Design a binder for this molecule. Structure first.
Ligand SMILES: O=P(O)(O)OC[C@H]1O[C@@H](O)[C@H](O)[C@@H](O)[C@H]1O
Ligand SMILES: O=P(O)(O)OC[C@H]1O[C@@H](O)[C@H](O)[C@@H](O)[C@H]1O
Lengths: 474, 474
């Protein structure tokens, strides 16, 4: 006997500002780091960018009407920092606040609960220009200022907030792999920026306790649960190293205010540990979140890796299956293909049991409620004559993950809600428009902008059915 | 770049009263549950019992002189509760207290640190007869009276104390597997007795803070870290289930005062959860220990197990290799042979890297210091002419574990000490005398006490060197 989904379970879907909004220079909006970065040659798939994206800024009324038709209980979206503070720092742009106020109003008028992500990777370029953005403690005061603005403005209508979206991704990709702005490959700077982001997250959770006393806040972590390749002790040890370095390094800070000691000692042995200042620990430890947000797509299997072994690997940005290669930390661990799971055309593992495992690990270790703020299947879709998108692959992916969530709930994990990625098709940062996640197909590709018309996929109706029955029918 | 062992690392060896002391009915000692149990036909190997054991009660001065020759920094022994309270909870037997006083004085006169185990499985039979011993909350006050008696008599001279030795073993063997007294096979009774023992542990730690304010105290957990068989998600899930039901069930209570939720919910779904009285949680949560005591011998590899699958397995008590069979909890997990590790003649896995993994898991999850209270190799030994015992297999085993401990210390695990099991050969509860662990061979077997003479094994001189060089020389 499975527990039922709780009565007010947030059946949701999600987007991110730069990926959907467009209107990149309208109504006072300032330059963001992604405005700049995406226009640099070779940074994105086929030079795609979010100048227009899917034009959600102008079509939000249509999109919300499709959410209402779907029956969504919740919609997760991010506020574009550069829309609200074009300089990051100076005067509020009221036109920018007015759009999100219009959007929230529309959501509530249709009975949809808004989930607002404060930061989804688009720090204003002015802050990067002024002081290096996440590499400077000044961004703590500046990020706080921007969040308190949003708290005061919308605290009365938005109950659920996410602080930083996938801090582990935009810090690592932006400062170690050089695939995100600022395009740096410097492990020392990476950990300094990561430590500052940790302090920013804690500071605004504290501010949230004052300005929105009845609300619920937490970060959203990009969680890939690690697996050992097999029962060889050296591979299990590699799994221990990988889970602590890739996952506990962030989630222990979110939940306990402390870095894990083995990873710290390893970084300290190389001078790579972050600069701690007086008060940092007191701040980090005095900022408990209401939940752990989890973005989940896949697990990662690892094995032992010699000190001279694999480092950076190839990542599949083209959808040509089988082109990614193993990556790792020399001496600690390396990724390896898990022969027991299928993979997508971008080589992502399809592992719905991995989601239950991951939910269990977080409940077991931190004792916190979980909001699944992203989960979904990115794949090619074909538009058929008659406005038919038969995305059975995506229905099956989502069905199996939702089934594992109910088993995790039965196991005692307190799951607050589930936000599928994504509501409409949107621009994938590094993969372009062909890597589609939406319940709603958007009519454009990487060559032609066409008309951006929305078309309901087969998965739209499946998920509408799920929400209708509170998950009882999948 | 290995860290050295700390200057005052407690290089130790260990015993347990019933396995070593003999003198089972001398100087006013009462019956323990093991005096009665081992004299029941069929309960022990070839009917062996601890009536004489290796006669340490009369020979302790010889044995301590050998410890000083070895240069032991610490000696871990248990107090026989039935020596001190012949009927468990009446008047104190002063001759019983006088033996441990003479032993402790003998240790301290040779510069050896006493490490006292309050409970190593031998609750007096009178308490079993009166109210069922660990199945009654009456044992909480009776164990507290006995602990405080020792705290007051010896607290000036003993700083390191262990409360319950391997609660997970004596409770599950005594109440689920029927292999220890009282010989019960009842899962409901097992979890009730286990909960009472948790309360008795917390209560004595509370008392300890009052009577030995400068001392250090902890339980000693029988830790077998779990491995998944491979990266199949269902086997990783079995591993999550195993680590939670076999390990977190006890260690979360010791460290955090809380049972893990997924295991609790599974027990509750069957009416197997223990009876919780008001005040239980407050007591369990207000008894933090100074260290986690870790008894380590081997890892366990697990895979998925259907609801009709494996339950109880065969355990090797004869030293005939390849006689153990798989065990598990149907629906949750089953053990499986780990093809990457060697095994002893009793089918115990030899996995020194598993100790490093186990130490890392405890440090990472609980941030506690660890005292390794047992580790060693039980094997056949041959006495050759000239009183020579060349146990290079034991040296090899111990050397590799001590090396993995040093690597764990380098990772940042705070390891207080290392007690090898055992100082002299002694009675193995279920395996008789032929399964030897000692640094010191004792001349006797299952059929004759012979002369009980002590003979230093090759490993004696190896450990002596280890201690002399503080582990620099392994
Ligand atoms: O677009 P991708 O690379 O396929 O990832 C899919 C999604 O999951 C996370 O990475 C991000 O929070 C989203 O913004 C989105 O990018
Ligand atoms: O004697 P065995 O079964 O080989 O195990 C060796 C040791 O195991 C631990 O569980 C006990 O604390 C010791 O008393 C000793 O028995």
């Amino acid at each position: 006997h499975l527990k039922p989904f709780p009565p007010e379970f947030l059946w949701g879907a999600a987007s991110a500002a730069y990926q959907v909004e467009g209107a990149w220079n309208e109504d006072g909006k300032g330059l963001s780091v992604w405005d700049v970065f995406a226009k640099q040659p070779g940074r994105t798939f086929k030079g795609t960018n979010g100048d227009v994206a899917v034009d959600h800024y102008h079509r939000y009324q249509e999109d919300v009407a499709l959410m209402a038709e779907m029956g969504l209980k919740a919609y997760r979206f991010s506020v574009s920092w550069s829309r609200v503070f074009p300089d990051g720092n100076g005067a509020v742009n009221e036109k920018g606040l007015d759009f999100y106020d219009r959007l929230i109003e529309e959501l509530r008028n249709h009975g949809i609960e808004p989930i607002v992500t404060l930061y989804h990777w688009d720090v204003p370029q002015a802050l990067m220009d002024a002081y290096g953005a996440w590499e400077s403690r000044r961004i703590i005061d500046d990020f706080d200022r921007y969040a308190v603005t949003l708290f005061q403005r919308f605290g009365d209508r938005v109950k659920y907030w996410v602080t930083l979206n996938e801090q582990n991704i935009f810090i690592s990709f932006g400062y170690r792999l050089g695939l995100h702005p600022p395009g740096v490959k410097d492990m020392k700077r990476m950990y300094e920026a990561n430590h500052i982001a940790n302090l920013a997250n804690a500071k605004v959770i504290q501010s949230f306790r004052h300005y929105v006393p009845d609300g619920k806040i937490g970060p959203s972590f990009a969680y890939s649960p690690m697996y050992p390749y097999d029962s060889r002790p050296e591979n299990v040890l590699a799994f221990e190293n990988a889970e602590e370095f890739q996952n506990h390094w962030w989630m222990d800070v979110y939940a306990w205010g402390m870095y894990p000691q083995a990873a710290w000692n390893y970084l300290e042995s190389q001078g790579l540990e972050p600069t701690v200042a007086p008060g940092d620990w007191e701040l980090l430890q005095a900022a408990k979140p209401d939940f752990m947000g989890v973005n989940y797509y896949q697990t990662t299997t690892v094995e032992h890796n010699p000190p001279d072994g694999v480092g950076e690997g190839v990542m599949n940005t083209t959808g040509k299956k089988g082109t990614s290669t193993s990556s790792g930390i020399p001496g600690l661990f390396k990724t390896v293909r898990n022969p027991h799971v299928d993979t997508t055309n971008w080589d992502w593992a399809i592992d719905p049991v991995g989601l239950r495992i991951g939910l269990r690990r977080i409940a077991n270790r931190y004792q916190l409620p979980i909001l699944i703020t992203e989960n979904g299947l990115g794949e090619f879709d074909t538009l058929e004559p008659g406005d038919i998108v038969n995305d059975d692959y995506r229905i099956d992916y989502l069905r199996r993950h939702v089934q594992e969530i109910q088993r995790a709930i039965t196991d005692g994990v307190d799951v607050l809600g589930y936000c599928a990625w994504s509501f409409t098709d949107l621009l994938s940062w590094l993969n372009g428009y062909q890597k589609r996640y939406g319940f709603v197909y958007v009519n454009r590709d990487d060559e032609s902008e066409k008309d951006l018309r929305r078309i309901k996929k087969k998965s739209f109706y499946w998920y509408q059915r799920v929400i209708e029955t509170n998950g009882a029918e999948l």
